[PDB]
Design a protein around this ligand. Sequence first.
Ligand SMILES: O=C(O)CNC(=O)C(=O)O
Ligand SMILES: [Mg+2]
Ligand code: NI
Ligand SMILES: [Zn+2]
Length: 331
Amino acid sequence: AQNPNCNIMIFHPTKEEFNDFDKYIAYMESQGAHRAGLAKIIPPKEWKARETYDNISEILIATPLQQVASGRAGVFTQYHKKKKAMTVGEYRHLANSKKYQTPPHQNFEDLERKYWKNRIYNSPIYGADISGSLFDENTKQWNLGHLGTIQDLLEKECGVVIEGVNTPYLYFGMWKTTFAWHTEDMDLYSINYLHLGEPKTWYVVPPEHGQRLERLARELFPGSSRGCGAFLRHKVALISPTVLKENGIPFNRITQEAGEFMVTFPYGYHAGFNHGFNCAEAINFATPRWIDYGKMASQCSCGEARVTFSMDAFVRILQPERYDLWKRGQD
Ligand SMILES: O=C(O)CNC(=O)C(=O)O
Ligand SMILES: [Mg+2]
Ligand code: NI
Ligand SMILES: [Zn+2]
């Protein structure tokens, strides 16, 4: 069995290997990359996402989100307070202001310590989930706006034709902006490209051990767990690496830098934080190996998780028994 310790693998595809996306995901899996839940892909040196970023300040962040924490430094939840619209230019200035900028630090490790120690005492502002793309239309390889769609995958594998579309989203981050512990909708894959700016630190639990994280989360957030049997779908819970180690939860960590791709694999729980102003683009995707995960994915039916239009058909086809209850939570 490849990668039995479930380490995060890092790949360096050649320009020839970078042509066929599906093929290279399958190659990574042949090497056991999926066992980690997360892999890093460094693009060949000849590749570029676009010519320059000199022209991005006019993008609008219609609903910036202030991430307000409650709890203790290692175990907290966050809620999103909506703020008034601002341009990327305005947001980048805010990020770099004395109130929000990255503190002096020695290295990534020192900064990680400062994050876990101090995150709860501040409320950074995140420009998340902005439909759009920063890839040049002429970038042919690993262009997140030109991937094969999940609907087409399900049609190819299962023969059914369904409605829905699949497009990428932009994320503008600053110091301490946070992604809570989650798997993707319907336990899909995700791919994330860090277009510019400061790094993003990731934590991941191997898919084969996801239920261990879920058990801990029920223990740590006991009122949340009573309200909903899939409350990690709410994307509000944070658990530090120290707490995970104390409770024996297997996990790994890695820092993504500008110009690098990360792939999350089905049912790979992940969480993390941004080091300073940055812009990432991400999109969900499927492969034939995903279908069995989609069929088993948990669902939030309490009303909180509220998701895209396209998840309907996934639930309808893959999880017909659950569909009526899940849709009640959507309506
Ligand atoms: O970049 C972020 O804030 C969070 N991204 C993801 O969870 C992802 O790409 O799956
Ligand atoms: Mg612009
Ligand atoms: Ni994710
Ligand atoms: Zn719920």
